[PDB]
């Protein structure tokens, strides 16, 4: 055989609809390797997962496992260049990312199918021998301190690290996962310790026996084998014992507790946690997936339905949680409402009444069998995933499951084990419960404070009298076991291609009532179909009042159909219903077997909807706080939000939405629904297994239902208006300035507006964005260390495009403006002095990126729908533009920069958005920035838009 290969798993059980070939193999140094052959993919990928996470970090240096992760992308032995890895992938249409979990560390990347070997070699140099520079450390420690700083005021990370801190100080579960400058630079210097620690950690835990490699490409299995053996059989083996944690962070002094936590946002979530043993080895039966399916069920007579009718909660989740090798968690989280906050004890009481209901009726074999079929069907008709994320997740689960049963690891279930189900369910008792209640009402009534995040909370102990009530609980009659799933598809027949088949979605129904687009699937051949519907109505966004009544309408509708839709949700038939600036948006995606049944029930309940006052007040209240929760979002998101407000003709801010919300009464909404459904216009897209007559019948069903119940009469052609983008003048600089009231960091967005989305203007922008794509990430973040979040690319809106820069940091926005302007000059100098080859590199890179065909049906449906909502209908856009792209020269880009993006451009449409930090003032080497003209301050948006023209709309094809 082969000396470098220990064993070969030539037979990997794959999906029958999967045409890709798989070959698993175990190397001599104990590296589990899986190879995927896909000769038709446009982008190859590879991923390596080390079984060492941030739980094995030294007690002195916390967040070291995550820190070393960032140090690997900064120069190696064979490739001493600091940004060799990053630059190489960008020049060949690729990307890369990494993340450190509890006991995991994943590194993945995708790239063009031609330069896989060259990229795989550079990736292999990260584990053999990494050079940790003395200055790269001093800069990356700021990058780690900044990526943690952006998560300080985030309720998710605050509650995640709190359940760690409230646990056992001895157990590694309480250790800091992320880590900041204090743990990486400050503390080691205060005790005289760091680069030597990076070397010792990489040489003690980053061993071959704890690594898993998964490579995907166009190459054959033998060529991929000879390449992995070439690069990964040289990895040093040390046989490091896999860190196991048989101990549990929770114990006698950690159970039966009350953690009253004060959140940043105005939310009220209750967290019930059950400490359970590691269920990873029971994957063949998966008792946690069983009990999670019953408890978190949203169907009639479930735990959610009972807690809804009492007017206590809105959502219920659900299932088991992940911890580490040795322990897991079985959580039942639930949101506290007006009455739910006052009846928390009664909510948990009902929970145990449902748990007692499961213990009473005992383990059901027909339920497990139903889960077996649902999972088996979902595995067979499984969508082809994108190479990058696919190899990333497989490499992570390669350590747990055998080589031949990886693709079928989390999908197929074998032998019914009720005793294992009974074992987990036994751990679900009031004697083993951990309650964590979060509310804003606990403001100023807390005693303790978290260390790293500074979270205000108070720890209490639930009285045994309450425990007795939960133990001695009578079975509730409302709690019923879910019946047989009547939405399980039985017909998977793929309808043969018709004689009038079309490569692109065509228009088959153009009337005053509705416009219909139909594209029968001819690429993926599954038994699924995507049904998107866009309802146009003037009374949806005419004023903040109707804007609120429209949102409350669809939220009440989704609330009323929550039970009926969930039964089809488990059967792979989902639906999405959200309101847009033009009206409504319905999107039913899933199996087309019982799909018209779901759609009919949606439309029929949509036309004739009777509002419940109790549910009206609850949703209205939750929507009010949601508009106040927007107050605490990250700066860069506010910059993008404000820019959307500025450039758009009509837009309503959050503050005047809640002001109008205070005038929304129940009788007003009842009279608003028929008025809203009075006149409509439906632009749809039916893309799937259905035929033309089937599509027409579906459209006919929707129209005939709306006409019968809601009396819908068609709109006018001149009544269908699309909003425009504000036309900026030449050499005009505009700045909007507001403050982020929560985060102590500042965000900024610089938008250079270009001209009207034409083939010429499109490729002049995207190619330029391609050239400056990687240098932006390298100069602004890797070299100058402005902030963790550095982004640059094209911005398309209302048929108008341009170049946008998005940076979040703690530095002055005006300083960031200068550094970007200085970046534009040194990049214009770069393009001017590069060879012809250095230009064809970026052309070919963008070309492959644009020609990356969709992976599944929902991906292709998203592209077509985007070309429809933009009302351009340019389905052949990618082919025409790339053809024009390869015919471009460098002189055209220089002219494009001098005319549109130069510091003294004759047509420079530059608008900026400054988002300051909380306590930052308002009034006030390297490449030096040019002198910038005096900008204009935007204080009132109405007076701003009234003083500027409006762009025309892009005419369809």
């Amino acid at each position, epitope marked *: 055989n082969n000396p470098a290969i220990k064993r070969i798993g030539n037979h990997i059980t794959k999906s029958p609809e999967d045409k890709r070939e798989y070959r698993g193999l175990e190397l001599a140094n104990g590296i589990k390797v899986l190879l995927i052959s896909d000769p038709t993919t446009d982008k190859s990928s590879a991923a390596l997962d080390v079984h060492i996470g941030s739980l094995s970090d030294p007690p002195n240096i916390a967040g070291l496992s995550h820190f070393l992760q960032h140090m690997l992308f900064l120069g190696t032995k064979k490739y001493p260049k600091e940004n060799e890895y990053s630059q190489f992938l960008s020049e060949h249409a690729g990307s890369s990312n990494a993340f450190t979990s509890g006991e995991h560390t994943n590194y993945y990347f995708d790239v063009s199918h031609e330069h896989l070997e060259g990229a795989l070699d550079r990736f292999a140099q990260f584990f053999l021998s990494p050079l940790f520079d003395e200055s790269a450390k001093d800069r990356e420690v700021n990058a780690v301190d900044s990526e943690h700083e952006k998560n300080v005021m985030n309720d998710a990370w605050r509650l995640f690290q709190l359940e760690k801190a409230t646990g056992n100080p001895k157990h590694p579960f309480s250790k800091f996962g992320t880590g900041n400058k204090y743990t990486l630079e400050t503390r080691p210097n205060q005790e005289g310790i760091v680069r030597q620690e990076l070397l010792k950690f990489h040489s003690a835990y980053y061993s071959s026996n704890l690594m898993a490699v998964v490579v995907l490409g166009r190459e054959s299995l033998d060529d991929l084998t000879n390449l992995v053996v070439k690069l990964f059989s040289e990895v040093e083996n040390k046989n490091v014992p896999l860190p196991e944690f048989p101990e549990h962070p929770f114990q006698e002094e950690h159970l039966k507790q009350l953690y009253k936590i004060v959140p940043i946002k105005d939310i009220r979530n209750l967290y019930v946690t059950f400490p359970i043993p590691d269920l990873q*080895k*029971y994957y063949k039966s998966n008792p946690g997936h069983y009990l999670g399916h019953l408890i978190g069920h949203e169907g009639p007579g479930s735990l959610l339905s009972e807690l809804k009718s009492k007017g206590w909660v809105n959502t219920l989740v659900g299932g088991q949680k992940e911890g580490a090798r040795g322990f897991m968690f079985f959580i039942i989280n639930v949101d506290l409402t007006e009455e739910g906050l006052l009846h928390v004890e009664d909510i948990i009481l009902h929970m145990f009444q449902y748990i007692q209901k499961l213990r009473a009726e*005992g*383990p059901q074999e027909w339920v497990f069998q139903e889960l077996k079929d649902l999972n088996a069907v979902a595995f067979r008709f499984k969508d082809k995933e994108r190479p990058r994320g696919y190899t990333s997740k497989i490499a992570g689960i390669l350590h747990y499951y055998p080589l031949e049963e990886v693709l079928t690891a989390e999908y197929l279930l074998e*032998e019914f*084990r*009720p*005793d*294992l189900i*009974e*074992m987990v369910l*036994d751990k679900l008792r009031p004697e083993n419960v951990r309650v964590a209640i979060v509310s804003k009402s606990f403001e100023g009534k807390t005693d303790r404070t978290e260390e790293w995040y500074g979270t205000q909370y108070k720890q209490e102990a639930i009285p045994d009298e309450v425990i007795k009530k939960w133990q001695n609980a009578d079975l509730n009659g409302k709690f019923k076991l879910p019946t047989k799933n009547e939405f399980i598809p039985t017909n998977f027949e793929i309808l043969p291609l018709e004689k009038e088949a079309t490569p692109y979605p065509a228009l088959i129904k153009d009337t005053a009532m509705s416009k219909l687009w139909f594209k029968q699937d001819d690429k993926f051949f599954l038994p699924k179909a995507n049904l998107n519907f866009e309802f146009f109505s003037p009374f949806a966004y005419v004023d903040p009042l109707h804007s609120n009544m429209a949102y409350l309408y669809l939220e009440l509708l989704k609330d009323s159909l929550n039970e009926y839709a969930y039964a089809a949700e488990l059967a792979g038939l989902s639906y999405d219903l959200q309101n847009t600036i033009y009206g409504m948006y319905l999107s039913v995606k899933g199996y087309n077997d019982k799909q018209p049944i779901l759609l009919k029930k949606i439309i029929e309940k949509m036309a004739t909807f009777e509002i419940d006052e109790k549910r009206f007040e609850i949703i209205k209240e939750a929507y009010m706080r949601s508009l106040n929760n927007f107050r605490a979002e990250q700066p860069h998101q506010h910059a993008m939000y404000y820019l959307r407000l500025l450039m758009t003709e009509v837009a309503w801010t959050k503050d005047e939405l809640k002001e109008a919300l205070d005038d929304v009464t129940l009788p007003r909404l009842k009279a608003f629904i028929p008025q809203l459904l009075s006149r409509l216009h439906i632009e749809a897209l039916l893309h799937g297994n259905i035929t033309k007559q089937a599509a027409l019948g579906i459209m006919q069903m929707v129209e005939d239902t709306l006409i019968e119940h809601a009396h819908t009469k068609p709109l006018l052609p001149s009544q269908l208006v699309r909003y425009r983008e504000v036309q900026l003048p030449d050499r005009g600089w505009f700045v909007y300035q507001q403050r982020n009231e929560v985060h102590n960091n500042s965000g900024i967005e610089i938008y250079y507006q270009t001209d009207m989305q034409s083939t010429s203007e499109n490729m002049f922008l995207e190619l330029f964005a391609q050239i400056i794509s990687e240098p932006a990430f390298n100069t602004l973040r890797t070299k100058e260390q402005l902030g963790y979040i550095v982004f640059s690319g094209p911005r398309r809106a209302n048929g108008i495009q341009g170049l946008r820069f998005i940076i979040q940091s703690e530095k002055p926005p005006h300083y960031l403006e200068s550094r970007v302007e200085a970046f534009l000059i040194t990049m214009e100098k770069s393009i001017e002095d590069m060879t012809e080859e250095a230009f064809q590199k970026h052309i070919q890179a963008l070309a492959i990126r644009r020609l990356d065909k969709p992976k599944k049906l929902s991906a292709e449906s998203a592209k077509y729908w985007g070309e429809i909502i933009s009302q351009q209908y340019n389905f052949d856009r990618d082919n025409t533009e790339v053809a024009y792209l390869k015919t471009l020269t460098k002189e055209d880009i220089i002219k494009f920069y001098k005319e549109m993006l130069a510091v003294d451009a004759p047509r420079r449409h530059k608008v900026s958005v400054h988002v300051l930090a909380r306590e930052m003032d308002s009034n006030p080497n390297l490449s030096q920035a040019p002198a910038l003209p005096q900008p204009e301050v935007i204080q009132n948006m109405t007076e701003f838009k009234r003083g500027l023209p409006l762009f025309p709309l892009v005419k369809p094809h």
Partner: antibody, heavy 120, light 94 residues
């Protein structure tokens, strides 16, 4: 496979089964005796994982079952009771000792047995 | 809880009678008892398709000379208790 030992001469008034091919830490080892000229009769079984020991209504107090991480044992002090002792193992893994119902998963592998007679 | 003697010739249909979902075992005279059926109805690997289970009963399709032995049952009651049966011996009637 299972390797039994310890049975033989005993005056009125330990057994060792060394497991091979698997680990005892993830399986339940059972002991079954059979009186010469009669049928089978279960005496005591142990689950090392969940740490629970079970005994019959005719041997409890006298007998004692144990194991080690891979070999299992059975300490019998007061004898009378003369039979052939076999040892078997559940086919499935991690069978929960505590139960309110009955789930008899078959005992796939056995041992030929070791004879032990008690007589004055 | 299981007769103790059945007289049936070769090639005949045998029906041996006997918590929940009992199991079935076979012990030939001399050596260790082997498993044939673990849940109510389940054929263990290597076991002939002549054997089959149903409700607490064991059936043999075509009685072979190699099937002449003493069959036992196994009922794993709760609290980790395992109880066998009286054991039925299969004889020939010639």
């Amino acid at each position: 496979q299972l390797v039994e030992s310890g049975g033989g001469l005993v005056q009125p008034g330990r057994l060792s089964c060394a497991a091979s091919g698997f680990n005892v830490s993830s399986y339940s080892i059972h002991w079954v005796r059979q009186a010469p000229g009669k049928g089978l009769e279960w005496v005591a079984s142990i689950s090392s994982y969940y740490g629970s020991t079970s005994y019959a209504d005719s041997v409890k107090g006298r007998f004692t079952i144990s194991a080690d991480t891979n070999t299992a044992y059975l300490q019998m002090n007061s004898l009378r009771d003369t039979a052939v002792y076999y040892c078997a193992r559940d086919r499935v893994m991690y069978y929960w000792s505590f139960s309110k119902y009955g789930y008899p998963y078959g005992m796939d592998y056995w041992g030929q047995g070791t004879l032990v007679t008690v007589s004055s | 809880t299981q007769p103790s003697s059945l007289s049936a010739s070769v090639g005949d249909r045998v029906t041996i009678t006997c918590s929940s979902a009992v199991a079935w075992y076979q012990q030939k005279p001399g050596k260790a008892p082997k498993l044939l059926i673990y849940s109510t109805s389940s054929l263990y690997s290597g076991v002939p398709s002549r054997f089959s289970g149903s409700r607490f009963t064991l059936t043999i399709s075509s009685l072979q000379p190699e099937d002449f032995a003493t069959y036992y049952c196994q009922q794993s009651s709760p609290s980790f208790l395992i109880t066998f049966g009286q054991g039925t011996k299969v004889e020939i009637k010639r």
